[PDB]
Amino acid sequence: IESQAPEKLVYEPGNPLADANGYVKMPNVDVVGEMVNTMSASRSYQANIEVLNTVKSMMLKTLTLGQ
Amino acid sequence: LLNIFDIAGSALAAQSKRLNVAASNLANADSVTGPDGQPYRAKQVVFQVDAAPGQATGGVKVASVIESQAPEKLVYEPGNPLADANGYVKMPNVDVVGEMVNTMSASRSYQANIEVLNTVKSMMLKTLTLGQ
Amino acid sequence: DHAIYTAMGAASQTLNQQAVTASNLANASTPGFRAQLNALRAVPVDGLSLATRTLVTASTPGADMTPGQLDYTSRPLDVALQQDGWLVVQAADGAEGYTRNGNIQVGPTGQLTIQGHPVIGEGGPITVPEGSEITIAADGTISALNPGDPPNTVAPVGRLKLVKAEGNEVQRSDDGLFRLTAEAQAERGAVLAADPSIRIMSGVLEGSNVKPVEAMTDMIANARRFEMQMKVITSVDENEGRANQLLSM
Amino acid sequence: MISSLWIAKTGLDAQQTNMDVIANNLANVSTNGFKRQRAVFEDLLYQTIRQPGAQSSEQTTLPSGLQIGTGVRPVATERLHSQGNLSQTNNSKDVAIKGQGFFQVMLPDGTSAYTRDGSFQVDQNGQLVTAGGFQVQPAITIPANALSITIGRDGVVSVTQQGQAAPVQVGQLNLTTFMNDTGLESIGENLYIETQSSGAPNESTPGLNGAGLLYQGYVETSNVNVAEELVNMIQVQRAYEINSKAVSTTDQMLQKLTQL
Amino acid sequence: ISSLWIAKTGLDAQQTNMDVIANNLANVSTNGFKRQRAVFEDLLYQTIRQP
Amino acid sequence: ISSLWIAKTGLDAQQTNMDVIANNLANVSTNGFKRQRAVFEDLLYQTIRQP
């Protein structure tokens, strides 16, 4: 989906793409929030990778049932 | 190139080109003439999002570095050639404080993308040891 | 692990405070500008056990209605309001905004226009004869003397309406113009009275009340708080990463 | 890039523009008829983020909403048309103005400009010109052998001939007044051109219909109050330093963010 | 910021006073000239509220 | 920067003015000498378009 932040503006009435009351529309990125998002995304990805490895080890030792 | 390596590397290359435009403008502030004999027209970079086809999002393309159309602020020297009637030298239209702020902003964006690349790279090394 | 979010919040919101200060601080030497004071709100997270987290949401409680300090320009129609006074101005959409900018101007056709979207007084927009030579009195009356007529013809041509309202009962409206808070509307009504006790200081303008002292420590505390948040984030992620070894093997 | 950096940037640019105004204003002392120019700034549209709630008034509560806002764009450079002092040049062809009014002048490209400057001369043909050869309108042509020129208090310009005990009335030097004097478009060279913000020019004889009178042998001075400019220079310098501090603080915070 | 503008107003008042003094002193030996005195006046006061 | 350019023009104009003053002052006791006055003029104005 598309984030509904208020789409911050700047004011450069020398640059095109600035409307009447020259305002370059300037995408609405919360930089620190995105830093933290990547930080936590990496951590959760690593957790799930590990879960995969642990389950495979569980299953390969399941094969050694009996013998 | 893997997907995020492409996105972040494009960010890095775009930021580098923006920084080069800023450095060139800052260095040619107060430069009377070009080679052909013309005002040095200040430069700007326009950032488009990359990946027009497919998902419409990801990466940055900065093709077609263009010219900032501010009015070429003038000085009066009717002893210097390069001055028209009502002697007026052409004197580049570079906004030096804008260029310093732009330089700091470009550096910070550069470093942020470096940092995201570092984190994701640790993630990928962990990925490949999947099982074995 | 969710602690990082709270810390993130603080960091993010601190930047917002910085932003406010910056806009609050670039606007020095902007006529009649009202500093937008800011605060941080604790936000508890009431939940099912162990209420331990609180967020740091940023906010702007209002504007600083402390009269900025006056510049004497001797220009006949530069106006300074007394404390808690406002000039009423027909806003862009059309409604009575309130300003402290007394830098009045006249168009060729005689429209009194504090920077355009004109001024409102005792009726619609105030209009004066084209050869204005305006003078503005202490209580708001506006007199006009055509340049080539005997000076005993300065009959008043209008009155400048002034309104008393301050702080709690006034909020900014996404332009430089203030309005009533809609809590002060089941009160002194939609359109206020002229309050014939607010005085005018003629030939004098008012500058912005941007206190550099409190802004400088606003910024100092903001920077320190930001990098404290960064330390908390660093410790939290290092904790989680070193923790992730539990599940393997 | 975050909003703080660019907001402080526009603050720095506004202070730079104010300093440009002050420097021009200070260079143009000893420019006859020059009008001091004052920079007027304005805030930019406030980006609201969270509308305020309701004041429940049960307890004293802070009215917290959130709007950030930006920018200090320069909205005008007004021209303060107050009467400047006069200086005696003893020069017969010089002239100053008493009250509102401007001299109409024909530019080489054919349009008419207007000037509050009286340092006139005569070209080799006898026409009144303005230190730059711009003809004064309507054209006033002086005979070849005038002993003296006199420009009266309503512009009736006349010359004295050898032998005549009568100053043949040689021309009329009429004025032009504008409805909004401040709106004129200063094109440099001490000339203004009329624009939609000033209205059509109303031409009339000096002293009538609101136009001023004429003082021969005197020239108007620049009305620049150097005390205002010096104090404004101090203001501009310290505001610039403050905004520079804001940029530095934001940059350091961004560095700390991007380390991790 | 604040004291800067206050002192600038003081400078402007002193300069107006000096201008009037200069016009008085220059116009000595002008017939029937009536000398001029400038009366000054403090500007609006701002009230800081005591809780 | 443009402010420095403007101020340099102002300094040049004042120094030209001083040169004219000094030439007038030196040539006192020169027969038939006609004094000189420097007349100045502002430069073109940069227009910034309001959106």
CSV table of N, CA and C in Angstrom, one decimal, chain D residues 86-207:
chain,number,residue,atom,x,y,z
D,86,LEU,N,17.6,68.1,0.2
D,86,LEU,CA,18.0,68.8,-1.0
D,86,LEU,C,19.5,69.3,-0.8
D,87,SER,N,20.2,69.3,-1.9
D,87,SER,CA,21.5,69.8,-1.9
D,87,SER,C,21.7,70.9,-3.0
D,88,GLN,N,22.4,72.0,-2.7
D,88,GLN,CA,22.5,73.1,-3.6
D,88,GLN,C,23.7,72.8,-4.5
D,89,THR,N,23.5,72.7,-5.8
D,89,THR,CA,24.5,72.5,-6.8
D,89,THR,C,24.9,73.8,-7.5
D,90,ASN,N,24.1,74.8,-7.4
D,90,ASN,CA,24.3,76.1,-8.0
D,90,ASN,C,24.2,75.9,-9.5
D,91,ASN,N,23.8,74.7,-9.9
D,91,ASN,CA,23.7,74.4,-11.4
D,91,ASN,C,22.3,74.7,-11.9
D,92,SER,N,22.3,75.6,-12.9
D,92,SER,CA,21.0,76.1,-13.3
D,92,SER,C,20.1,75.1,-13.9
D,93,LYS,N,20.7,74.1,-14.6
D,93,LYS,CA,19.9,73.1,-15.2
D,93,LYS,C,19.4,72.0,-14.3
D,94,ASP,N,19.9,72.0,-13.1
D,94,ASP,CA,19.4,71.0,-12.1
D,94,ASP,C,18.0,71.4,-11.6
D,95,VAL,N,17.4,70.4,-10.9
D,95,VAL,CA,16.0,70.6,-10.5
D,95,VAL,C,15.7,69.5,-9.5
D,96,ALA,N,14.9,69.9,-8.4
D,96,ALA,CA,14.4,69.0,-7.4
D,96,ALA,C,12.9,69.1,-7.3
D,97,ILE,N,12.3,68.1,-6.7
D,97,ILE,CA,10.8,68.1,-6.6
D,97,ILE,C,10.3,68.3,-5.2
D,98,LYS,N,9.2,69.0,-5.1
D,98,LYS,CA,8.6,69.3,-3.8
D,98,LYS,C,7.3,68.5,-3.8
D,99,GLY,N,7.4,67.3,-3.2
D,99,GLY,CA,6.2,66.4,-3.0
D,99,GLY,C,6.1,65.4,-4.1
D,100,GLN,N,5.0,64.8,-4.2
D,100,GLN,CA,4.8,63.6,-5.1
D,100,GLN,C,4.9,64.0,-6.5
D,101,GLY,N,5.6,63.2,-7.3
D,101,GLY,CA,5.7,63.4,-8.7
D,101,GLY,C,7.0,62.8,-9.3
D,102,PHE,N,7.0,62.6,-10.6
D,102,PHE,CA,8.1,62.1,-11.3
D,102,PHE,C,8.2,62.8,-12.7
D,103,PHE,N,9.4,62.8,-13.2
D,103,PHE,CA,9.6,63.3,-14.6
D,103,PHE,C,9.5,62.2,-15.6
D,104,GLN,N,8.7,62.4,-16.6
D,104,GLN,CA,8.5,61.5,-17.7
D,104,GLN,C,9.6,61.6,-18.7
D,105,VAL,N,10.1,60.4,-19.2
D,105,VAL,CA,11.3,60.3,-20.0
D,105,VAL,C,11.1,59.3,-21.1
D,106,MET,N,11.6,59.7,-22.3
D,106,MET,CA,11.4,58.8,-23.5
D,106,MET,C,12.7,57.9,-23.6
D,107,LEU,N,12.5,56.6,-23.5
D,107,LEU,CA,13.6,55.7,-23.6
D,107,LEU,C,13.9,55.4,-25.1
D,108,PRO,N,15.2,55.0,-25.4
D,108,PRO,CA,15.5,54.8,-26.8
D,108,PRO,C,14.6,53.8,-27.5
D,109,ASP,N,14.1,52.8,-26.8
D,109,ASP,CA,13.2,51.8,-27.4
D,109,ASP,C,11.8,52.3,-27.5
D,110,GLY,N,11.5,53.5,-27.1
D,110,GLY,CA,10.3,54.2,-27.4
D,110,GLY,C,9.3,54.2,-26.2
D,111,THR,N,9.5,53.4,-25.2
D,111,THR,CA,8.6,53.5,-24.1
D,111,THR,C,9.0,54.6,-23.1
D,112,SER,N,8.1,55.0,-22.3
D,112,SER,CA,8.2,56.1,-21.4
D,112,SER,C,8.5,55.6,-20.0
D,113,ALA,N,9.6,56.0,-19.4
D,113,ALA,CA,10.0,55.7,-18.0
D,113,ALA,C,9.8,57.0,-17.2
D,114,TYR,N,10.1,56.9,-15.9
D,114,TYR,CA,9.9,58.0,-15.0
D,114,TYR,C,11.0,58.1,-14.0
D,115,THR,N,11.5,59.3,-13.7
D,115,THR,CA,12.6,59.5,-12.8
D,115,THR,C,12.4,60.6,-11.8
D,116,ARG,N,12.8,60.4,-10.6
D,116,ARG,CA,12.9,61.4,-9.5
D,116,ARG,C,14.3,61.9,-9.5
D,117,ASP,N,14.9,62.3,-10.6
D,117,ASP,CA,16.2,62.7,-10.7
D,117,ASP,C,16.3,64.0,-11.5
D,118,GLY,N,17.0,65.0,-11.0
D,118,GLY,CA,17.0,66.3,-11.7
D,118,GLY,C,18.3,66.7,-12.3
D,119,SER,N,19.4,65.9,-12.3
D,119,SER,CA,20.7,66.3,-12.9
D,119,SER,C,20.5,66.3,-14.4
D,120,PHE,N,19.9,67.3,-14.9
D,120,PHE,CA,19.7,67.5,-16.3
D,120,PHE,C,20.9,68.0,-17.0
D,121,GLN,N,21.0,67.8,-18.3
D,121,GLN,CA,21.9,68.6,-19.2
D,121,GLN,C,21.2,68.9,-20.5
D,122,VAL,N,21.9,69.4,-21.4
D,122,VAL,CA,21.4,69.6,-22.8
D,122,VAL,C,22.3,69.0,-23.8
D,123,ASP,N,21.7,68.3,-24.7
D,123,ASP,CA,22.5,67.6,-25.8
D,123,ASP,C,23.0,68.7,-26.7
D,124,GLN,N,23.8,68.2,-27.7
D,124,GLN,CA,24.3,69.2,-28.7
D,124,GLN,C,23.2,69.9,-29.5
D,125,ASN,N,22.0,69.4,-29.4
D,125,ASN,CA,20.9,70.0,-30.2
D,125,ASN,C,20.0,70.9,-29.4
D,126,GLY,N,20.2,70.9,-28.0
D,126,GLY,CA,19.5,71.8,-27.2
D,126,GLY,C,18.4,71.1,-26.3
D,127,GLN,N,18.1,69.8,-26.5
D,127,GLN,CA,17.1,69.1,-25.8
D,127,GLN,C,17.5,68.8,-24.4
D,128,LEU,N,16.5,68.9,-23.5
D,128,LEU,CA,16.8,68.4,-22.1
D,128,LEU,C,17.0,66.9,-22.1
D,129,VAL,N,18.0,66.5,-21.5
D,129,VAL,CA,18.3,65.1,-21.3
D,129,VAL,C,18.8,64.8,-19.9
D,130,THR,N,18.8,63.5,-19.5
D,130,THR,CA,19.1,63.1,-18.1
D,130,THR,C,20.3,62.3,-18.1
D,131,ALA,N,21.5,62.9,-18.0
D,131,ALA,CA,22.7,62.3,-17.6
D,131,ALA,C,22.8,60.8,-18.1
D,132,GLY,N,22.8,60.7,-19.4
D,132,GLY,CA,22.5,59.4,-20.0
D,132,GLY,C,21.7,59.6,-21.3
D,133,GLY,N,21.4,60.9,-21.6
D,133,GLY,CA,20.8,61.2,-22.9
D,133,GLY,C,19.4,60.9,-23.1
D,134,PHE,N,18.7,60.5,-22.0
D,134,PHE,CA,17.3,60.2,-22.1
D,134,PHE,C,16.5,61.5,-22.2
D,135,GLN,N,15.7,61.6,-23.3
D,135,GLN,CA,15.0,62.9,-23.5
D,135,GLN,C,13.9,63.0,-22.5
D,136,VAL,N,13.7,64.2,-22.0
D,136,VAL,CA,12.6,64.5,-21.1
D,136,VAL,C,11.4,64.9,-21.8
D,137,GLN,N,10.2,64.5,-21.4
D,137,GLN,CA,9.0,64.7,-22.2
D,137,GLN,C,8.1,65.8,-21.5
D,138,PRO,N,7.4,66.6,-22.2
D,138,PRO,CA,7.6,66.8,-23.7
D,138,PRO,C,8.9,67.4,-24.0
D,139,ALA,N,9.5,67.3,-25.2
D,139,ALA,CA,10.8,67.7,-25.5
D,139,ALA,C,10.9,69.2,-25.3
D,140,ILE,N,12.0,69.7,-24.6
D,140,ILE,CA,12.2,71.1,-24.3
D,140,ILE,C,13.5,71.4,-25.0
D,141,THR,N,13.5,72.3,-26.0
D,141,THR,CA,14.6,72.7,-26.8
D,141,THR,C,15.0,74.1,-26.5
D,142,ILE,N,16.3,74.2,-26.1
D,142,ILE,CA,16.9,75.5,-25.8
D,142,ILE,C,17.5,76.2,-27.0
D,143,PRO,N,17.3,77.5,-27.2
D,143,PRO,CA,18.0,78.2,-28.3
D,143,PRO,C,19.5,78.2,-28.0
D,144,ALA,N,20.2,78.5,-29.1
D,144,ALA,CA,21.7,78.3,-29.1
D,144,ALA,C,22.4,79.3,-28.1
D,145,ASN,N,21.9,80.5,-28.0
D,145,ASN,CA,22.6,81.5,-27.3
D,145,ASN,C,21.9,82.1,-26.1
D,146,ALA,N,21.3,81.2,-25.2
D,146,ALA,CA,20.7,81.6,-24.0
D,146,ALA,C,21.7,82.1,-23.0
D,147,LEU,N,21.5,83.3,-22.5
D,147,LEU,CA,22.3,83.8,-21.4
D,147,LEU,C,22.1,83.1,-20.1
D,148,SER,N,20.8,82.8,-19.8
D,148,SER,CA,20.4,82.0,-18.6
D,148,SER,C,19.1,81.3,-18.9
D,149,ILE,N,19.0,80.2,-18.2
D,149,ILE,CA,17.8,79.4,-18.1
D,149,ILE,C,17.2,79.5,-16.7
D,150,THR,N,15.8,79.5,-16.7
D,150,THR,CA,15.1,79.5,-15.4
D,150,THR,C,14.0,78.6,-15.5
D,151,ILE,N,13.9,77.7,-14.5
D,151,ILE,CA,12.8,76.7,-14.4
D,151,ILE,C,12.0,77.1,-13.2
D,152,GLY,N,10.8,77.6,-13.4
D,152,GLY,CA,10.0,78.1,-12.3
D,152,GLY,C,9.5,77.1,-11.3
D,153,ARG,N,8.6,77.5,-10.4
D,153,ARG,CA,8.1,76.6,-9.4
D,153,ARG,C,7.0,75.7,-10.0
D,154,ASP,N,6.5,75.9,-11.2
D,154,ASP,CA,5.6,75.0,-11.8
D,154,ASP,C,6.2,74.6,-13.2
D,155,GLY,N,7.5,74.6,-13.3
D,155,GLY,CA,8.1,74.0,-14.5
D,155,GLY,C,8.1,74.9,-15.7
D,156,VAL,N,7.6,76.1,-15.7
D,156,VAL,CA,7.7,77.0,-16.8
D,156,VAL,C,9.1,77.3,-17.1
D,157,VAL,N,9.7,76.7,-18.1
D,157,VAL,CA,11.2,76.9,-18.3
D,157,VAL,C,11.3,78.0,-19.4
D,158,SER,N,12.2,78.9,-19.2
D,158,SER,CA,12.4,80.1,-20.0
D,158,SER,C,13.8,80.4,-20.1
D,159,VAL,N,14.2,81.2,-21.1
D,159,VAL,CA,15.6,81.6,-21.3
D,159,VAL,C,15.6,83.1,-21.6
D,160,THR,N,16.8,83.7,-21.3
D,160,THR,CA,17.0,85.1,-21.5
D,160,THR,C,17.9,85.3,-22.7
D,161,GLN,N,17.5,86.2,-23.6
D,161,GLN,CA,18.3,86.5,-24.8
D,161,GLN,C,19.1,87.8,-24.6
D,162,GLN,N,20.2,87.9,-25.3
D,162,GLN,CA,20.9,89.2,-25.3
D,162,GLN,C,20.0,90.3,-26.0
D,163,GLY,N,19.5,91.2,-25.2
D,163,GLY,CA,18.8,92.3,-25.7
D,163,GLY,C,17.4,92.4,-25.3
D,164,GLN,N,16.7,91.3,-25.3
D,164,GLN,CA,15.3,91.2,-24.8
D,164,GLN,C,15.3,91.5,-23.3
D,165,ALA,N,14.5,92.4,-22.9
D,165,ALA,CA,14.2,92.5,-21.4
D,165,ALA,C,12.9,91.7,-21.1
D,166,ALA,N,12.9,90.4,-21.5
D,166,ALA,CA,11.8,89.5,-21.4
D,166,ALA,C,12.3,88.1,-21.6
D,167,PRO,N,12.1,87.2,-20.6
D,167,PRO,CA,12.5,85.8,-20.8
D,167,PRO,C,11.5,85.0,-21.6
D,168,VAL,N,11.7,85.0,-22.9
D,168,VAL,CA,10.8,84.2,-23.7
D,168,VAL,C,10.5,82.8,-23.1
D,169,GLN,N,9.2,82.5,-23.0
D,169,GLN,CA,8.8,81.2,-22.4
D,169,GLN,C,9.1,80.1,-23.4
D,170,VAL,N,10.1,79.3,-23.1
D,170,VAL,CA,10.5,78.3,-24.1
D,170,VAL,C,9.9,76.9,-24.0
D,171,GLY,N,9.4,76.6,-22.8
D,171,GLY,CA,8.8,75.3,-22.7
D,171,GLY,C,8.2,75.1,-21.3
D,172,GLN,N,7.5,74.0,-21.2
D,172,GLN,CA,6.8,73.6,-19.9
D,172,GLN,C,7.3,72.2,-19.6
D,173,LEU,N,7.7,72.1,-18.3
D,173,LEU,CA,8.3,70.8,-17.8
D,173,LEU,C,7.4,70.2,-16.8
D,174,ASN,N,6.4,69.5,-17.3
D,174,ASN,CA,5.3,69.0,-16.5
D,174,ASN,C,5.6,67.6,-15.8
D,175,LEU,N,4.9,67.4,-14.7
D,175,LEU,CA,5.1,66.2,-13.9
D,175,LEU,C,4.1,65.1,-14.2
D,176,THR,N,4.3,64.0,-13.5
D,176,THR,CA,3.4,62.8,-13.7
D,176,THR,C,3.3,62.1,-12.3
D,177,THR,N,2.1,61.9,-11.9
D,177,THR,CA,1.9,61.3,-10.6
D,177,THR,C,1.2,59.9,-10.8
D,178,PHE,N,1.4,59.0,-9.9
D,178,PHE,CA,0.9,57.7,-9.9
D,178,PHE,C,0.0,57.4,-8.7
D,179,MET,N,-1.0,56.6,-8.9
D,179,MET,CA,-1.9,56.3,-7.8
D,179,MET,C,-1.2,55.5,-6.7
D,180,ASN,N,-0.4,54.5,-7.0
D,180,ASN,CA,0.4,53.8,-6.0
D,180,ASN,C,1.9,54.0,-6.4
D,181,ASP,N,2.6,54.9,-5.7
D,181,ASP,CA,4.0,55.2,-6.1
D,181,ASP,C,4.9,54.1,-5.9
D,182,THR,N,4.6,53.3,-4.8
D,182,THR,CA,5.5,52.2,-4.4
D,182,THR,C,5.6,51.1,-5.4
D,183,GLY,N,4.5,50.9,-6.3
D,183,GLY,CA,4.5,49.8,-7.2
D,183,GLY,C,5.3,49.9,-8.4
D,184,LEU,N,6.1,50.9,-8.6
D,184,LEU,CA,6.8,51.2,-9.8
D,184,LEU,C,7.9,50.1,-10.0
D,185,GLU,N,8.2,49.8,-11.2
D,185,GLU,CA,9.2,48.8,-11.5
D,185,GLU,C,10.5,49.5,-11.8
D,186,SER,N,11.4,49.5,-10.8
D,186,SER,CA,12.7,50.2,-11.0
D,186,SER,C,13.6,49.4,-12.0
D,187,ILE,N,13.9,50.0,-13.1
D,187,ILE,CA,14.7,49.3,-14.1
D,187,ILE,C,16.2,49.7,-14.1
D,188,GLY,N,16.6,50.4,-13.0
D,188,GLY,CA,17.9,50.9,-12.8
D,188,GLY,C,18.1,52.2,-13.6
D,189,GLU,N,19.3,52.7,-13.5
D,189,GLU,CA,19.6,54.0,-14.1
D,189,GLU,C,18.8,55.1,-13.6
D,190,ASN,N,18.3,55.0,-12.3
D,190,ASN,CA,17.4,56.0,-11.7
D,190,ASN,C,16.1,56.2,-12.5
D,191,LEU,N,15.6,55.1,-13.2
D,191,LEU,CA,14.3,55.2,-13.9
D,191,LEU,C,13.4,54.1,-13.4
D,192,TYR,N,12.1,54.4,-13.3
D,192,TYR,CA,11.1,53.4,-13.0
D,192,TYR,C,10.2,53.3,-14.2
D,193,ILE,N,9.6,52.2,-14.5
D,193,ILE,CA,8.5,52.0,-15.5
D,193,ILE,C,7.3,51.6,-14.8
D,194,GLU,N,6.1,52.1,-15.3
D,194,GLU,CA,4.9,51.8,-14.7
D,194,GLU,C,4.4,50.4,-15.0
D,195,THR,N,3.7,49.8,-14.1
D,195,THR,CA,3.2,48.5,-14.2
D,195,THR,C,1.8,48.4,-13.7
D,196,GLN,N,1.2,47.2,-13.8
D,196,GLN,CA,-0.2,47.0,-13.4
D,196,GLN,C,-0.4,47.3,-11.9
D,197,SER,N,0.6,47.2,-11.1
D,197,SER,CA,0.5,47.5,-9.7
D,197,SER,C,0.6,48.9,-9.3
D,198,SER,N,0.9,49.8,-10.3
D,198,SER,CA,0.9,51.2,-10.0
D,198,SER,C,-0.2,52.0,-10.7
D,199,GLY,N,-0.9,51.5,-11.7
D,199,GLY,CA,-1.9,52.2,-12.4
D,199,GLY,C,-1.3,53.0,-13.5
D,200,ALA,N,-2.2,53.6,-14.3
D,200,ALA,CA,-1.8,54.4,-15.4
D,200,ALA,C,-1.2,55.8,-14.8
D,201,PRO,N,-0.3,56.3,-15.5
D,201,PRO,CA,0.3,57.6,-15.0
D,201,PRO,C,-0.6,58.8,-15.3
D,202,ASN,N,-0.8,59.7,-14.4
D,202,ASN,CA,-1.6,60.9,-14.6
D,202,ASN,C,-0.7,62.1,-14.7
D,203,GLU,N,-0.6,62.7,-15.9
D,203,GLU,CA,0.3,63.8,-16.2
D,203,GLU,C,-0.4,65.1,-15.9
D,204,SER,N,0.3,66.0,-15.3
D,204,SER,CA,-0.2,67.3,-15.0
D,204,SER,C,0.9,68.3,-14.7
D,205,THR,N,0.5,69.6,-14.7
D,205,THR,CA,1.5,70.6,-14.4
D,205,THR,C,1.9,70.6,-13.0
D,206,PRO,N,3.1,70.9,-12.6
D,206,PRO,CA,3.6,70.9,-11.3
D,206,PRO,C,2.8,71.8,-10.4
D,207,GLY,N,2.5,71.3,-9.2
D,207,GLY,CA,1.6,72.1,-8.2
D,207,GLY,C,0.1,71.9,-8.4
